[PDB]
Write a protein that binds this ligand. Structure first.
Ligand SMILES: *[C@@H]1O[C@H](CO)[C@@H](O[C@@H]2O[C@H](CO)[C@@H](O[C@@H]3O[C@H](CO)[C@@H](O)[C@H](O)[C@@H]3O)[C@H](O)[C@H]2NC(C)=O)[C@H](O)[C@H]1NC(C)=O
Ligand SMILES: *[C@@H]1O[C@H](CO)[C@@H](O[C@@H]2O[C@H](CO)[C@@H](O[C@@H]3O[C@H](CO)[C@@H](O)[C@H](O)[C@@H]3O)[C@H](O)[C@H]2NC(C)=O)[C@H](O)[C@H]1NC(C)=O
Lengths: 97, 49, 52, 314, 52, 52
């Protein structure tokens, strides 16, 4: 929808196809000038930049920092980690010693 | 962010022009009648209306 | 890979070498305007307006 | 070398107001302004290319500008770009200008004519830069972090950017007709003119020399200079020549590139301990962002733009 | 004087949601043309949305 | 505020200042700054340069 996030969309950064809906509308030129007037709803991406609101970096629970490239959540304390082990005989000590 | 491309107008005078459709995103085209353009040295397109 | 009416010459070596613009400006510009869609336009431009 | 600008000329466009509140055709018309650089550097676009003399030779002192289908030149100095305050010019090549400006609600460009008369054109533009980071500082400090950003560079190498150029139309002109007595003369000097006079039989065609029609007055004959040797520009304020158009390709200077900025670090706030509570004193010098969250199962969010000295309990 | 852009209309059940995009302070006012009107007037500065 | 000044015979600046709260608003319903190239024509008033 025009004026909000995603007014123009592309399937990939290098993709040729493009879907744009910004309500571009033409108007009759004023007499005695050559200017091609037009009107258009402002960009939705610039709007989203100004009123996105909060984030997940300052909102995530359990006190774990969000990073990007790749998207991941680090040092995020929850749950238990079962551990399975298999030790050789060289680690132990004989009871006589 | 998008960018609007607006080519120069084609003032065909002492005649007429017809709009042609194209496969461009959010394309818009119209033809106007009765223009009498002016330039710095004067007004071309002899035909009055 | 560029074309001139019925020439079909490589874009790297135009047939107007050298001084394509100086010898005939209008012909050079009208030759450029017919190759805007070709992938090798910029190589032809690099040779069309280059002569010492 | 290559010298792309050998087949390109300045042009005359239409300006909203030329520095005084009146509209007239000026050779320093402003096209779109690009401000997609993080640090806040604009790219104004003239209609009269600067940095190249009349004779198509590179030069650091002269600039080209159109004047009545005749190209003249003006000194590079006196080129003033301005806003509510006054700007600083960083780079220069062809049509484009680089500048850094104080916040304002408009910008104008002007430079002296051949006869030392200022030619200006101002456009409405809401400029309000914001430095990258979490503090709205004004100038860089001598101690701080390094934060990546983007900016325009001064190199004019290959950029993979486009300008569409098209052949100029036939410029109207009527100062050439000199009606003496029941006849007219057509002025020449390098301009092959077109004419169309509906008196008697066919009086259409082109020419490169003086003529006489000897039949009518100047009411019907008109002159259209048909210069066809130099690409001009694809601007909405100048008409086209043919229906399919011609088009062309020209690179722009000053591509965008990664650099790093320096940002200040605010003072450490004063903490006062309590019973499961912290009273926090904040002393900012300029608008800083303050935010906190509780790292439990259900956090308790907050973020704010602190401006003056405050006192918060967390 | 300039003319501002047309606001975006979104229809509803006896309601209209208007999205307003001003470039500079503009005046927005509406009234209900019944028997007892519903007066309103405001100075819009930034991008907002209104239900009328 | 506003000030007026001009150089003396000895190339010395003579100036004077007066307090004045200047803040104009253009005629219409929009608080624009610079006239556009496409808009309406609203009547106004101004001082003319004639000395009749
Ligand atoms: C030189 O100027 C003369 C000005 O008279 C141009 O003559 C005009 O030519 C156009 C093109 O045919 C005429 O338009 C025609 O109008 C009739 C109706 O009258 C219509 O049925 C046709 O379909 C066509 O649209 C126009 O009438 C005519 N001017 C006058 C006063 O009759 C002439 O074309 C110009 N030369 C060039 C090369 O442009
Ligand atoms: C400033 O630096 C950043 C990070 O180095 C630049 O962003 C990165 O730009 C490269 C350009 O090659 C991107 O690489 C591309 O990756 C895609 C992945 O499929 C690949 O298909 C392309 O062929 C290309 O190699 C990269 O994605 C991009 N983002 C990163 C690394 O996170 C940025 O362009 C720089 N800004 C400048 C130079 O103005």
């Amino acid at each position: 929808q025009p004026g909000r996030f995603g007014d123009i969309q592309s399937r990939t950064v290098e993709s040729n196809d493009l879907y744009a809906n910004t309500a571009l509308k033409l108007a009759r030129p004023s007499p005695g000038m050559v200017h091609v007037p037009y009107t258009q709803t402002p960009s939705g991406f610039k709007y989203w930049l100004k009123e996105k609101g909060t984030a997940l970096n300052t909102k995530a629970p359990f006190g774990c920092q969000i990073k990007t490239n790749p998207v991941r959540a680090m040092n995020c304390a929850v749950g238990n980690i079962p551990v399975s082990m298999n030790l050789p005989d060289s680690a132990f000590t004989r009871i006589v010693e | 962010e998008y960018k609007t491309v607006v080519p120069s107008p084609y003032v065909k005078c002492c005649g007429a022009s017809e709009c042609s459709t194209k496969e461009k995103p959010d394309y818009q085209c119209k033809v106007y009648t009765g223009v009498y353009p002016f330039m710095w040295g004067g007004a071309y397109c002899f035909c009055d209306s | 890979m560029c074309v001139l009416a019925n020439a079909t010459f490589p874009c790297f070596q135009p047939p107007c070498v050298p001084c394509c613009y100086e010898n005939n400006a209008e012909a050079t510009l009208r030759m450029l305007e017919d190759n805007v869609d070709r992938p090798g336009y910029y190589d032809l431009l690099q040779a069309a307006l280059t002569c010492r | 070398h290559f010298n792309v600008y050998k087949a390109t000329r300045p042009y005359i466009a239409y300006c909203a107001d030329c520095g005084a509140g009146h509209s007239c055709h000026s050779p320093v018309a402003i096209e779109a302004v690009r401000s997609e650089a993080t640090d806040g550097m604009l790219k104004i676009q003239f209609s009269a290319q600067i940095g190249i003399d009349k004779s198509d030779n590179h030069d650091y002192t002269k600039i080209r500008y159109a004047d009545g289908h005749a190209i003249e030149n003006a000194v590079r100095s006196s080129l003033k770009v301005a806003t509510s305050g006054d700007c600083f010019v960083h780079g220069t090549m062809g049509h484009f200008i680089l500048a850094k400006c104080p916040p304002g609600e408009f910008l104008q460009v002007s430079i002296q004519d051949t006869r030392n008369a200022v030619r200006a054109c101002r456009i409405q533009y809401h400029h309000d830069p914001q430095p990258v980071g979490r503090e709205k500082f004004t100038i860089r400090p001598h101690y701080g972090k390094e934060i990546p950003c983007t900016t325009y560079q001064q190199t004019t190498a290959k950029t993979v950017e486009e300008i569409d150029m098209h052949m100029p139309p036939d410029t109207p002109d009527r100062t050439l007709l000199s009606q003496q007595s029941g006849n007219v003369k057509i002025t020449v000097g390098g301009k092959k003119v077109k004419y169309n006079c509906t008196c008697g039989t066919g009086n259409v065609g082109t020419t490169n020399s003086d003529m006489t029609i000897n039949t009518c007055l100047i009411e019907q004959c008109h002159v259209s200079v048909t210069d066809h040797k130099k690409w001009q520009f694809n601007s909405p304020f100048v008409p086209r020549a043919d229906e399919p158009a011609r088009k062309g390709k020209v690179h722009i200077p000053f591509p965008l590139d990664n650099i790093t900025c320096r940002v200040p670090m605010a003072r450490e706030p004063t903490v006062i301990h309590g019973k499961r509570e912290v009273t926090l004193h904040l002393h900012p010098d300029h608008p800083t962002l303050f935010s906190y969250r509780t790292l439990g199962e259900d956090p308790q969010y907050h973020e704010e733009w602190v401006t003056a000295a405050v006192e918060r309990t967390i």
